[PDB]
Amino acid sequence: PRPLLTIETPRHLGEQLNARRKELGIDLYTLELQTGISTSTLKRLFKDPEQVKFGSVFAVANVLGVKLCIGE
Amino acid sequence: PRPLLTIETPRHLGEQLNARRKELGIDLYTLELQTGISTSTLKRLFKDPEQVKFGSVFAVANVLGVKLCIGE
Amino acid sequence: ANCRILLTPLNERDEQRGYSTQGLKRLSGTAKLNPRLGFTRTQFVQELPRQQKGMSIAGYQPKLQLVLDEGEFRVVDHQGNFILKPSPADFPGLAENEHATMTLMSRLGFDVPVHGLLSFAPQSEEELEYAFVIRRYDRDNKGLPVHQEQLDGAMQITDKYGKTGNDNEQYVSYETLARFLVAHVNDNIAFKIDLFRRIVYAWLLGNNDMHLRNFGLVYSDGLTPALAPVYDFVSVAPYPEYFYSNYLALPLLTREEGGRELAPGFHSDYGEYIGQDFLLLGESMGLAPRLLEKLFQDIRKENAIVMETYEQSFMTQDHIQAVLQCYRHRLGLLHHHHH
Amino acid sequence: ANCRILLTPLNERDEQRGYSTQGLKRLSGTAKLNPRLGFTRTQFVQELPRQQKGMSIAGYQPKLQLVLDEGEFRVVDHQGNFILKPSPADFPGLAENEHATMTLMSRLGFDVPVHGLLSFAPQSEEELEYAFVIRRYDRDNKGLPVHQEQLDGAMQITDKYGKTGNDNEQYVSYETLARFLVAHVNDNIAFKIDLFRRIVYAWLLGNNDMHLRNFGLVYSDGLTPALAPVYDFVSVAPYPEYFYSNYLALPLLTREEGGRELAPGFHSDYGEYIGQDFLLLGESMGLAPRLLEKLFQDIRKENAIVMETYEQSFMTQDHIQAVLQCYRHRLGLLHHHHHH
Amino acid sequence: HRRVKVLLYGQVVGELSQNDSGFLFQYAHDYHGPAISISLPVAQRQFPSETLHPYFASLAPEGWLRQRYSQIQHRDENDLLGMLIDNGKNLLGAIQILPW
Amino acid sequence: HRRVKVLLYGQVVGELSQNDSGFLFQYAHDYHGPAISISLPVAQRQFPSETLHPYFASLAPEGWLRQRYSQIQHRDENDLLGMLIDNGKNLLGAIQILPW
């Protein structure tokens, strides 16, 4: 029921979010209009969002229906 | 069975990480020497890390033993 | 010279047949499909007397369960994979109306199950009668059942139109329906955009019968359900008495429930649902203004598909002109926006 | 004078008793604790020949299981809540050594269970003999048991000192031990820093007997384990032959396992474990160089506590200056890294 | 007056009961599988309603299909669950309503 | 040779058996609870070792504590399972080993 996936690297999150984007069929232009994040910055988020602000990563996640959880 | 808390806002994560820091007894100076993140940037991360880079947030979380998971 | 399944121009080899090979393969999966049924209407579709009325045009539509053995269609008592909806006696031509509208929705990018037109066996030497056919979305690869439930039961609402009061007023809205769906299904912009596009095109194409029972929730495993494909999409514009009753089956905005308030477009000089009304519905679903503006501009460029699909259809020319009149008028009203 | 539990200066009211009200409240939880347990030493001991001359210094220490009944201690055959370790006959004063060392570790921020010194009943009006007592960490509130595990069994290691080979060399190191712990317990900087400081302060205070059995894993919450508190921390400096055997019980770095290689400090003129060796241990655990440097500077300012605590202790004065000599010497060796 | 069995995916999941006071649908205490509707969560095992639960009401046919069946099966008007029994096998989805 | 039962947190959780060839510690059948050691995971249910499993060997006392029984039944060069038997209740933690 729960497919929780431990994110090991910032790059891991970016690549895993990009897979959901292509799965749902959404394009960068569509995301840019909603989120406000530039098209160039969006591709950077799907490579390594280490240098992208956390608000932008969290925003794209909510747009793709992915929830973010923390634990130990 | 591991308890999990769904992060709803960037503020939610930032404040929850400060709670873990204070519980474990860790100091802001100590965190700066290990992570490299300045003390001033650390103060903002524990309020609203919306404008702090994801790499800094992910780094502090692992130093505090907090794991980050994603799931729809 | 056009196909009875795909509404695409026919080749010289396929012209006489009336059905293109690609279209037959879309429905059945084989190129040997016989789209000419071997049973007359009188065999199965019993013509029942007039109802007590006060119902919709779809309450008069008969329904026949079909199954595909070999390449010929066949009628079953219960649990088939296809459904055959002939034209009502009092409303002739409705099967061609459903076909054209549903073919348009498939061309517009929506999830529409495979559909087409089939021919009844003649009795003497009459003009062939045509009936709409559609494949059930509650079936898997091997016709295995997939669970589905209509929104009226899920929302714990007793009436299809939201008339859950002592008055004929409606207490369920399209805005509230979207909120319910968002909570139970996945909240991605792809689901939101498609649902928004479903409501606008129901208004644009004059479908004032998108009641709660015309919405579904399919549990394709993975636990989380998803919105069902588009079904029972007919245009009511050719029939004025039924058309002028209501613009849309349910109130658009939640403020309009129970007659408590009115839409801003009703207060405007146009006195109708305008662009600002659907814009407010989009903002409720969480869609940003820049996205909403682009989504509006996309719908405008799609007028070529709407006109062409209906003009290539097998509907009566008087019925075609009716739907196209409703479309162009309402299409222009979407520009009374603010962004 | 000083308290026999907290080694703190006594007020006029608590002077005569010898035990401060604060200390008695720390041990039992009541201020009506009678630290004169009666029960003479000959009552509850059994003496007998030496097993093997040289079997550690702690291998001769007796252990007595105790329970607290209405402010007076009582001996139980099995499953108590306190443990009484008198001083061995051949090594008098060891109870006072354990007390002082464990009190020092408590003052330094470590997790040390409640401990103190108790007085045996006199027989023929001789000077009272004092015995160390400590509370078992395997009990929670109301004395309910919590499961624990020793590291040697967890690591599937047959010998406490790592002599698991065909020769006579040690094949387990402090570095490898740290790696094992990191995997099973939570990887937070607080655990890493505390573990690092345990190893450094074992060396600084001359404890060459921190074997794998002196490490524990307590399964409190259930699944996730945690490092056990500091226990059996005694200084081996007063006893030269036992002290001169080994610098530390186990090899510091993994490179030294099996005699394969030597520490950088061994090749230096000092020929001993120095600061650069401990710096390499920290980098292995993941500690940053700037953090390690500050952690070193903190230890230097902590010399005041070490001197004061031992000078306030009830150890023989001859035993005290021995421990302080080892401390002063090894503490200076922590500066031989010459890095910024 | 009547009692029926609710079947999902070929397996008995619950029981729907009609008494003078109302309708009661209860899941099986040993049934921890999927829910037949989001309106009927498996967490709660008891569903008392003086009227037919809207899920089972929506499972009924309408329009021409109802009229064709009403001239022939013509049972007690608003028998509700009695109508569902006759159309149990032909129920859309993976749900079946079968007599006790 | 010897048949002894292993109880954790009071209830009996495992079985310790010494056979001609060696030692076997096996969990029960309905036990999906916690493991008595990380070296003996509850996932894997069979643990055959020709030597005493390092966990049970480490559970035995040493030095003066052992010396009391080496004087009583000469527990020197003697079976460690017998030593553990005498100290089954005296085992640190929540572990106890008692015979069948």
Residue numbers in the entry:
A (entry chain A), B (entry chain D): 36 to 107
C (entry chain C): 2 to 340
D (entry chain F): 2 to 341
E (entry chain B), F (entry chain E): 2 to 101
Wording from the paper:
Enteropathogenic *E. coli* (EPEC) O127:H6 encodes an additional, tripartite TA module, *hipBST*, for which the HipT toxin was shown to specifically target tryptophanyl-tRNA synthetase, TrpS. Surprisingly, the function as antitoxin has been taken over by the third protein, HipS, but the molecular details of how activity of HipT is controlled remain poorly understood. Here, we show that HipBST is markedly different from HipBA and that the unique HipS protein, which is homologous to the N-terminal subdomain of HipA, has evolved to function as antitoxin by breaking the kinase active site. We also show how auto-phosphorylation at two conserved sites in the kinase toxin serve to dually regulate binding of HipS and kinase activity.
